Tab-separated table of C-alpha atoms and ligand atoms in Angstrom:
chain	number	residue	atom	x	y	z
A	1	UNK	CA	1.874	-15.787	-12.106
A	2	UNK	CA	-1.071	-13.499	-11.623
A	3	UNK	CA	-4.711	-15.055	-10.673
A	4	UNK	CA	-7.965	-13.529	-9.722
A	5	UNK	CA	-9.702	-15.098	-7.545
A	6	UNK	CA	-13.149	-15.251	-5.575
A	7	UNK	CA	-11.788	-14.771	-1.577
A	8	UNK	CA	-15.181	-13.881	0.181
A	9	UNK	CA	-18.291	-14.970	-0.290
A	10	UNK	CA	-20.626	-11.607	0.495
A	11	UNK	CA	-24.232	-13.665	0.833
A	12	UNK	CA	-23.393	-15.179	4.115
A	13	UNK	CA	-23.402	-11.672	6.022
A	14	UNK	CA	-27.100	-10.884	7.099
A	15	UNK	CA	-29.430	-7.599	7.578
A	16	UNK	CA	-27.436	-5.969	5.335
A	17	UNK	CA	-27.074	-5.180	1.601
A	18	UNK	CA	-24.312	-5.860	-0.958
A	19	UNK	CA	-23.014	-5.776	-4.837
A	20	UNK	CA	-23.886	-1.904	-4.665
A	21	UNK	CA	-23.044	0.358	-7.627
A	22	UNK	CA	-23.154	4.380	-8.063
A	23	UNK	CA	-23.631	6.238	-11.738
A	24	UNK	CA	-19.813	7.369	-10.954
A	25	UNK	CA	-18.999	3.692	-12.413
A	26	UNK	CA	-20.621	3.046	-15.160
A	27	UNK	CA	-20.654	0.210	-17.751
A	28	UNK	CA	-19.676	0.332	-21.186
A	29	UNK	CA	-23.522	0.905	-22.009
A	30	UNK	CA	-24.042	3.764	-19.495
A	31	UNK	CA	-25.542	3.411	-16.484
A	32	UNK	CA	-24.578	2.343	-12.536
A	33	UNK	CA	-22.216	-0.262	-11.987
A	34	UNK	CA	-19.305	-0.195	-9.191
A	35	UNK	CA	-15.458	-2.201	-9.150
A	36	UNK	CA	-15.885	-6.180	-9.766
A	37	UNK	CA	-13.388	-6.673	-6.976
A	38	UNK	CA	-14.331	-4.386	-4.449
A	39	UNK	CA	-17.926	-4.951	-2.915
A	40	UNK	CA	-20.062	-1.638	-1.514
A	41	UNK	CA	-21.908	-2.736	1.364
A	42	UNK	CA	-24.645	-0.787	2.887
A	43	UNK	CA	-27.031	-0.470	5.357
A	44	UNK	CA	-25.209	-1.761	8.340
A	45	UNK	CA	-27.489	0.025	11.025
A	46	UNK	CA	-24.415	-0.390	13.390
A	47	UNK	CA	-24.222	-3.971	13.316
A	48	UNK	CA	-20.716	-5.779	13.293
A	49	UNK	CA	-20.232	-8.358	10.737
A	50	UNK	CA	-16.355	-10.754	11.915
A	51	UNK	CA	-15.070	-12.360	8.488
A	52	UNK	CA	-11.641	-14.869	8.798
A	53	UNK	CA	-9.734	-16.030	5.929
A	54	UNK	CA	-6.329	-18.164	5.504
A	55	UNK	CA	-4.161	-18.007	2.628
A	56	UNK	CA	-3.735	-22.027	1.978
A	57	UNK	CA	-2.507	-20.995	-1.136
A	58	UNK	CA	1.024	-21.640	-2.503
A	59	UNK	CA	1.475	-17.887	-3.626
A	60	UNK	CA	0.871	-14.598	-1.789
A	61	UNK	CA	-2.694	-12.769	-2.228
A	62	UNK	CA	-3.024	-9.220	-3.027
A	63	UNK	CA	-6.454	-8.060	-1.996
A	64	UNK	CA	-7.471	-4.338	-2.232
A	65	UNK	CA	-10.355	-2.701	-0.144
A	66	UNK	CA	-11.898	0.965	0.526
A	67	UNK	CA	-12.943	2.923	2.889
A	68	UNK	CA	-16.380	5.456	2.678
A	69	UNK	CA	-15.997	8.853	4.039
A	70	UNK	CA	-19.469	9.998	3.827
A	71	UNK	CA	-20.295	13.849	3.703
A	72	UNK	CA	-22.781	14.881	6.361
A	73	UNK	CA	-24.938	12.703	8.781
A	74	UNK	CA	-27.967	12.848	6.320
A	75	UNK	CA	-25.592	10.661	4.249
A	76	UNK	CA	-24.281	8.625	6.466
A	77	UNK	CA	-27.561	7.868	7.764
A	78	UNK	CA	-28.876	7.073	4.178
A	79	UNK	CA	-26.252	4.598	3.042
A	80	UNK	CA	-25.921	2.775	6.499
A	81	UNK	CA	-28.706	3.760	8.939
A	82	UNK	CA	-26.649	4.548	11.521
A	83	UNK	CA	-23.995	7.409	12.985
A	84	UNK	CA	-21.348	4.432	12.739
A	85	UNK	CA	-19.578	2.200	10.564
A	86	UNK	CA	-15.434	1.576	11.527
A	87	UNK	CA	-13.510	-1.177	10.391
A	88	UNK	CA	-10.521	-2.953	11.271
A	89	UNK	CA	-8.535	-5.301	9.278
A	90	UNK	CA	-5.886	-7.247	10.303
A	91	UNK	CA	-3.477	-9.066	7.919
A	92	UNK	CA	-1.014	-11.245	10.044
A	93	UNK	CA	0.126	-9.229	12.724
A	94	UNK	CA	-0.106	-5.921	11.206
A	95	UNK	CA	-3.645	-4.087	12.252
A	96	UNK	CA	-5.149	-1.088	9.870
A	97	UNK	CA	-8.100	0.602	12.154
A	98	UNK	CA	-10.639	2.987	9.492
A	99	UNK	CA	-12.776	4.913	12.104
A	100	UNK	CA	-15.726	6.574	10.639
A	101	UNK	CA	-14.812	10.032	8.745
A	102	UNK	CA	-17.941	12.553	8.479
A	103	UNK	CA	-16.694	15.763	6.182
A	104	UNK	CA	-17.558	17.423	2.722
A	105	UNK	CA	-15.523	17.680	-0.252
A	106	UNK	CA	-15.770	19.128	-3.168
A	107	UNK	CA	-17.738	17.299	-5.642
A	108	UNK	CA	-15.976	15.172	-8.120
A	109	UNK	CA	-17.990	12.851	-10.273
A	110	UNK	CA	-21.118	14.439	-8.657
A	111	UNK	CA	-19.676	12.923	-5.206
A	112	UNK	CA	-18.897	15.143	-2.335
A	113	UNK	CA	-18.263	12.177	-0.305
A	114	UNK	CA	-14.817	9.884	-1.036
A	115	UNK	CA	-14.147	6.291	-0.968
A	116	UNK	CA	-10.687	5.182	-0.319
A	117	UNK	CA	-8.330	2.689	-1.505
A	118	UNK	CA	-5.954	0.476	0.609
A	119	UNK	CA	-4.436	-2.748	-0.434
A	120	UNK	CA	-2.345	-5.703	1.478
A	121	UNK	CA	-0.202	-8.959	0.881
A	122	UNK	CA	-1.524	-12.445	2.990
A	123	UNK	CA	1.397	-14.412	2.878
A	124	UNK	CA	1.041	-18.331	2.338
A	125	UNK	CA	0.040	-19.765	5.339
A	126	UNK	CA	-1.230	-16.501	6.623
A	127	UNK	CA	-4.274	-14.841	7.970
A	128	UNK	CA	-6.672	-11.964	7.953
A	129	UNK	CA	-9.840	-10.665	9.368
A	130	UNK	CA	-12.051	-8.120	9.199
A	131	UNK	CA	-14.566	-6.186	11.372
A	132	UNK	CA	-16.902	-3.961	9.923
A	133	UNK	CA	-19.902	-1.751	11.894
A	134	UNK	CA	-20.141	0.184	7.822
A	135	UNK	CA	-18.641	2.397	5.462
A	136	UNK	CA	-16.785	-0.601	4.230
A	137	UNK	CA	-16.307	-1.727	0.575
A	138	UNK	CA	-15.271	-5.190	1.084
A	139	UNK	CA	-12.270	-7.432	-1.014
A	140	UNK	CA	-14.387	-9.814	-2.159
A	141	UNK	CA	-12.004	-10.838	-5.092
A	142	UNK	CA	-8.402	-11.172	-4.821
A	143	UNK	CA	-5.330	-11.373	-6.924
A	144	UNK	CA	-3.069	-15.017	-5.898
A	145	UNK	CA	0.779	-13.668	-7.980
A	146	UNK	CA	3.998	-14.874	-7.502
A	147	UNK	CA	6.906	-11.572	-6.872
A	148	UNK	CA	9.703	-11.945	-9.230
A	149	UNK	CA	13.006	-10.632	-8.419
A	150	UNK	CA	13.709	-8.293	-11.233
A	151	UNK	CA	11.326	-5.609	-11.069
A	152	UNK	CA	11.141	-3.712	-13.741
A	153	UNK	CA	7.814	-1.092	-13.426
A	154	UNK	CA	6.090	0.763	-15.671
A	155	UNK	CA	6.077	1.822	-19.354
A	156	UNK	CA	4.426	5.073	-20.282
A	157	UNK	CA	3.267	5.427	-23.917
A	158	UNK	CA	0.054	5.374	-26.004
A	159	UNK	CA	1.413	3.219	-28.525
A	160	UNK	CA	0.607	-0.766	-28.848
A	161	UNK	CA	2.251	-3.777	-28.190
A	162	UNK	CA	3.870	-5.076	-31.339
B	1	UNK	CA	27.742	-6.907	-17.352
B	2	UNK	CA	24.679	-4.665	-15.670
B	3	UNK	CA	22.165	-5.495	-13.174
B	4	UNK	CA	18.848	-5.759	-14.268
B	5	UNK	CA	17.780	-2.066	-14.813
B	6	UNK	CA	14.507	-0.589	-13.765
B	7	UNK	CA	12.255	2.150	-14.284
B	8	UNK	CA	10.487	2.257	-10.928
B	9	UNK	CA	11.745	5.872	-10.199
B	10	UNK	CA	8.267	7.415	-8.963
B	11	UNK	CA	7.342	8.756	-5.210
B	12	UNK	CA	4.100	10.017	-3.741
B	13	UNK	CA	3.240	13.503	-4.571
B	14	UNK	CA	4.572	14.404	-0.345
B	15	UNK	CA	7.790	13.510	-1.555
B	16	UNK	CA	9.457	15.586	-4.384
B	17	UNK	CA	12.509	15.533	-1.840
B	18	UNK	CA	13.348	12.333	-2.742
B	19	UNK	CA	12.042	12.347	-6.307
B	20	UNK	CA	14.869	15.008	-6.333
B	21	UNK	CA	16.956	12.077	-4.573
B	22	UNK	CA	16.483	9.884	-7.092
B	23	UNK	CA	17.043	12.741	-9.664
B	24	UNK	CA	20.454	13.748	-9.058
B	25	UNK	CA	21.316	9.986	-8.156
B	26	UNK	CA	20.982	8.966	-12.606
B	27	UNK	CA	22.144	12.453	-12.749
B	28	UNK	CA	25.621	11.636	-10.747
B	29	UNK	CA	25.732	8.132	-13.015
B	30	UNK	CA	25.096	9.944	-16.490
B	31	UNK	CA	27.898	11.548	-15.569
B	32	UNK	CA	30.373	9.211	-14.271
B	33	UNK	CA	29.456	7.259	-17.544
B	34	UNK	CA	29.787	9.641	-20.020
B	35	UNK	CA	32.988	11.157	-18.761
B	36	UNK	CA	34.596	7.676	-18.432
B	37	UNK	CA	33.290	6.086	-22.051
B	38	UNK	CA	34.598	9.340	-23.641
B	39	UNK	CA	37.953	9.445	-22.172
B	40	UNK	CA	38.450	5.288	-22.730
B	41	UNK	CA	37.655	6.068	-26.477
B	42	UNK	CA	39.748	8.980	-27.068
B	43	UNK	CA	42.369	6.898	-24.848
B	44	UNK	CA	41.753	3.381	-26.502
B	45	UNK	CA	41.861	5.323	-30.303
B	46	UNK	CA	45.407	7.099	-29.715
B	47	UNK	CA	46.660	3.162	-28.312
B	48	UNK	CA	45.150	1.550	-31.335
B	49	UNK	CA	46.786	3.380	-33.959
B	50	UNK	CA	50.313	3.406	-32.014
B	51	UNK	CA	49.733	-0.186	-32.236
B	52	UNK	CA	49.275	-0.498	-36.008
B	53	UNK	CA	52.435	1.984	-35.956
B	54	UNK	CA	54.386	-0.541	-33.935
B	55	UNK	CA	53.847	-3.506	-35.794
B	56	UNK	CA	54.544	-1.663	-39.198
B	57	UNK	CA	58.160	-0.388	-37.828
B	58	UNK	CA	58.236	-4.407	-36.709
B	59	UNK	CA	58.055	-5.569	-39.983
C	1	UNK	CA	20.187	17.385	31.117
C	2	UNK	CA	22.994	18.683	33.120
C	3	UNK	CA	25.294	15.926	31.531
C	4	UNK	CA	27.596	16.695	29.217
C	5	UNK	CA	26.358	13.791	26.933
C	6	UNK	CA	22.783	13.528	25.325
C	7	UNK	CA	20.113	11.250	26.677
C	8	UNK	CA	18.335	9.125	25.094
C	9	UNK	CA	14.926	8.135	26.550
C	10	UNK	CA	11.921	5.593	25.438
C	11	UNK	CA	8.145	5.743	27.034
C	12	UNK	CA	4.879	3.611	25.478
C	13	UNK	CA	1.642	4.863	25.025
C	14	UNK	CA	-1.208	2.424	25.987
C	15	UNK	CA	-3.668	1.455	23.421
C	16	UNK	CA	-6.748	0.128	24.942
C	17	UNK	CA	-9.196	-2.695	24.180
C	18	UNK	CA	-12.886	-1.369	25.277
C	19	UNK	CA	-14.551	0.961	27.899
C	20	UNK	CA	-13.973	-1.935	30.617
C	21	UNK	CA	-10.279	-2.397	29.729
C	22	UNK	CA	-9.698	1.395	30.554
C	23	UNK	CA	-11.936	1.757	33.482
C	24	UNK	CA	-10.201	-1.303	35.004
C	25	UNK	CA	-6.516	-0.037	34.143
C	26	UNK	CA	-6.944	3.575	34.842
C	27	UNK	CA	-10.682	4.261	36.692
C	28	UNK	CA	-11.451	6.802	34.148
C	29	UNK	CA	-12.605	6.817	30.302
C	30	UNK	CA	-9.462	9.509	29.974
C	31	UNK	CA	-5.679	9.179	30.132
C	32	UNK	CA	-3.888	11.627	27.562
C	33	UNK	CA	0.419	12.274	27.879
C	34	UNK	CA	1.950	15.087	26.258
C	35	UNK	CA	5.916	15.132	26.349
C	36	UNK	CA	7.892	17.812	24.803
C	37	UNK	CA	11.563	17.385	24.448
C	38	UNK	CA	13.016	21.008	23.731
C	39	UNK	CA	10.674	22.660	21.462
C	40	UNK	CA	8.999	19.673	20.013
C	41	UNK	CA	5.556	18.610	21.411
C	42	UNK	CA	4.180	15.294	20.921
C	43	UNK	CA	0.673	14.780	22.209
C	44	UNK	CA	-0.777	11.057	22.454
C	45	UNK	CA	-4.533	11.392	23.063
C	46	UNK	CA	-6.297	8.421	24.143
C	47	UNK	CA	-7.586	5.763	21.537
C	48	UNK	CA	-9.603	2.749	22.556
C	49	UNK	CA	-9.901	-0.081	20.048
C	50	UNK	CA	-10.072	-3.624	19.741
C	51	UNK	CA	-6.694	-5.349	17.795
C	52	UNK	CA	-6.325	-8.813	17.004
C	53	UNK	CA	-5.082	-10.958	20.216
C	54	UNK	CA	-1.186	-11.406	20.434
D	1	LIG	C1	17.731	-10.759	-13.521
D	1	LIG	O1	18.734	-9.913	-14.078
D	1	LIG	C2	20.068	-10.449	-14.028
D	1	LIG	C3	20.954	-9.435	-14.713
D	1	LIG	O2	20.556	-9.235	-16.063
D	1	LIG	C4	20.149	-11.834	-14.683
D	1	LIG	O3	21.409	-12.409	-14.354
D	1	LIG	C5	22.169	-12.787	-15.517
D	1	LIG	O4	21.812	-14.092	-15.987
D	1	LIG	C6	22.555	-14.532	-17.135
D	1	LIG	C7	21.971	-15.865	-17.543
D	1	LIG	O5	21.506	-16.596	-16.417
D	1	LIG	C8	24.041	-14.598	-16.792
D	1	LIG	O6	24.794	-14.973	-17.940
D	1	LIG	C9	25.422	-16.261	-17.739
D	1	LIG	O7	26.662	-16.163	-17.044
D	1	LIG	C10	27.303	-17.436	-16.796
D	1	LIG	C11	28.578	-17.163	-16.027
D	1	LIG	O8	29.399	-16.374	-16.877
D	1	LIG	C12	30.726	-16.230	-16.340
D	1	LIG	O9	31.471	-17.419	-16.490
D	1	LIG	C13	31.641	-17.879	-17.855
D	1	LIG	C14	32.448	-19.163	-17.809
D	1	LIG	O10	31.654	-20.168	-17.186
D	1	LIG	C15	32.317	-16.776	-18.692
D	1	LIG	O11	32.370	-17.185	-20.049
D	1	LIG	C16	31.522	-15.465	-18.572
D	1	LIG	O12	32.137	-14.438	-19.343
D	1	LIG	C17	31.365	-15.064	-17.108
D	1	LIG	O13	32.685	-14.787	-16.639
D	1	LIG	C18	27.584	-18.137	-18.146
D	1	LIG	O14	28.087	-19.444	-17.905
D	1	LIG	C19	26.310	-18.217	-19.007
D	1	LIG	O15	26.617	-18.753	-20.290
D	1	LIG	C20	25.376	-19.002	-20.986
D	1	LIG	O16	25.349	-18.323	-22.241
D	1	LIG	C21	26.319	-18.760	-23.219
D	1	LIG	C22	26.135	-17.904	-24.459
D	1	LIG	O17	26.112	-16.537	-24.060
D	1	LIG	C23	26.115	-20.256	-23.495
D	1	LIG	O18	27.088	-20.702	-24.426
D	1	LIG	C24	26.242	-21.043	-22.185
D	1	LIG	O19	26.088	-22.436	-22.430
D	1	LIG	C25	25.240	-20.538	-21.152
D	1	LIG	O20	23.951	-20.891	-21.656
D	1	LIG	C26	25.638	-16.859	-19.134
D	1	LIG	O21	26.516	-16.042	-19.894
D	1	LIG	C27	24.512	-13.236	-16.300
D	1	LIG	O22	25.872	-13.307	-15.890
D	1	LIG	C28	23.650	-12.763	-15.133
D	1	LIG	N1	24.058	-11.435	-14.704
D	1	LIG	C29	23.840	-10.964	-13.472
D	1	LIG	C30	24.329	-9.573	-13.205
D	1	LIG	O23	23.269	-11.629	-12.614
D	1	LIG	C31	19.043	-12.757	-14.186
D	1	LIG	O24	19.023	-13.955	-14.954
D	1	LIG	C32	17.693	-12.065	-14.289
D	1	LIG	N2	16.627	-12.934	-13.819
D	1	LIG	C33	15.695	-13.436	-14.636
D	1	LIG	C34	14.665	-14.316	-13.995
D	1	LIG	O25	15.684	-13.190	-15.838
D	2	LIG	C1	-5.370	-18.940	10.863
D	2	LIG	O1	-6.676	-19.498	10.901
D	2	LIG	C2	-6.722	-20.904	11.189
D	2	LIG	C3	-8.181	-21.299	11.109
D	2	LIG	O2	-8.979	-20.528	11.997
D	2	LIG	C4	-6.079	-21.197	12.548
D	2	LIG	O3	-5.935	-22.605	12.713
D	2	LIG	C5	-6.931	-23.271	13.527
D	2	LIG	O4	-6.767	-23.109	14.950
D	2	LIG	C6	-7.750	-23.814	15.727
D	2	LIG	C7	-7.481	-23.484	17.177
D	2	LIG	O5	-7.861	-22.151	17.490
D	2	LIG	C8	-7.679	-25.312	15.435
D	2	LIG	O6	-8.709	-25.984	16.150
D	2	LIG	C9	-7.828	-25.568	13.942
D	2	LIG	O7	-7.631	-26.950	13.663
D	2	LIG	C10	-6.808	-24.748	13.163
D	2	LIG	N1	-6.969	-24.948	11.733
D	2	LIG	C11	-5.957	-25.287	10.928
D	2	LIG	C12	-6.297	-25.451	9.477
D	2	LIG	O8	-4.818	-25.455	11.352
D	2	LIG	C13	-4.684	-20.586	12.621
D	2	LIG	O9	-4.165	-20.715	13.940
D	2	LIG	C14	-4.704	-19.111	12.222
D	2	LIG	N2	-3.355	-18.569	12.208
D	2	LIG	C15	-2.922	-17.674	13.102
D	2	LIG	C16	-1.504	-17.217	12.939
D	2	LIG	O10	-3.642	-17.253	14.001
């Protein structure tokens, strides 16, 4: 069983700006778009923003997140107004800190800057939070599956499914 | 009778050492395999025809 | 380690909350341990951080 599913809703977080997209993403027109999952939110000025959640599900949720490393303070102070921006999600017991990350890199995808990718399992019955001061991009869908014992992986071939 | 088999044989990119692991692990099995299913036929084909052999002298 | 056996030895690091939660503890916005066993070195430099309450 696999499900997407809608796990936060982003409008109820204030003085602050979401659903934002980059060139680096575009549709299949051209353009800016960004991940349908994963919500960019910017302008955070320092403020925190506390979201809870509880799995009353019957299945385990996968939900996947990221993480903005911005390249110099010019940029960090253009996406999120502020010298800031750490997060710190919590799923159960376990706690995953992201303190803010100020460096160059080479540009890929005309980005010198990197956002990066973490994911986590809420058990049924379970709970996470997160608190966010910026440079978050925010799991506001989710995927509800159900593990299966035999795991096979993954199939590597250009061909199609007959 | 096998357990389910499974291709899920890939590590991060820090961790050749035990890519290498995993390697010589289906490397060790190939060869426990093959020398086993050729010995059992060569074995098994010798038996069989002694046992045609036996049952003609039977007659 | 003048036995003739090896020792085995366990120590904690302390993780603080906030500013107030380390000046109450410890009186200072510091507190750093570095233990070397042999030639190893492990440094634990402070880190201050909220965590969910347990
Ligand atoms: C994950 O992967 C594993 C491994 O592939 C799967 O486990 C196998 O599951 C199958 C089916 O569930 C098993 O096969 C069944 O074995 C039963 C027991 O067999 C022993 O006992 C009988 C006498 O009762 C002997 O005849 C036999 O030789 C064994 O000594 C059988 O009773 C079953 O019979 C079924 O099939 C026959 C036709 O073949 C029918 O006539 C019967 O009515 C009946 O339907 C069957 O043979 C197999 O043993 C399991 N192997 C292992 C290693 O676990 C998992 O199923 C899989 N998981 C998922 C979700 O797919
Ligand atoms: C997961 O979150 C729920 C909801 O916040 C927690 O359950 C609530 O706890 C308060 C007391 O603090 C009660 O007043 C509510 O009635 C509870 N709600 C439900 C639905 O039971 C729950 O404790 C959290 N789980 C963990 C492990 O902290």
């Amino acid at each position: 069983h696999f499900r997407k599913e809608k796990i936060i809703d982003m409008t109820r977080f204030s003085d602050v700006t979401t659903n934002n997209v980059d060139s680096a993403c575009p549709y299949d027109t051209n353009g800016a778009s960004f991940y349908r999952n994963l919500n960019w939110v910017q302008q955070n000025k320092g403020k925190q923003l506390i979201f809870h959640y509880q799995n009353s599900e019957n299945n385990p949720l996968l939900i996947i997140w990221g993480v903005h490393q911005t390249s110099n303070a010019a940029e960090q102070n253009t996406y999120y107004g502020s010298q800031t921006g750490s997060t710190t999600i919590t799923i159960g017991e376990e706690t995953n800190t992201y303190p803010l990350v100020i460096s160059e890199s080479s540009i890929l995808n005309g980005h010198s800057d990197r956002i990066n990718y973490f994911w986590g399992v809420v058990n049924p019955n379970q709970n996470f939070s997160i608190v966010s001061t910026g440079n978050f991009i925010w799991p506001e869908y989710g995927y509800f599956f159900q593990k299966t014992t035999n795991i096979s992986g993954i199939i590597k071939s250009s061909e199609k499914i007959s | 009778n096998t357990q389910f088999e499974s291709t899920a044989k890939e590590f991060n990119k820090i961790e050749m050492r035990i890519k290498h692991l995993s390697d010589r692990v289906d490397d060790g099995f190939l060869d426990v395999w093959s020398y086993n299913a050729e010995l059992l036929v060569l074995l098994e084909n010798e038996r069989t025809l002694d046992f045609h052999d036996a049952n003609v002298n039977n007659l």
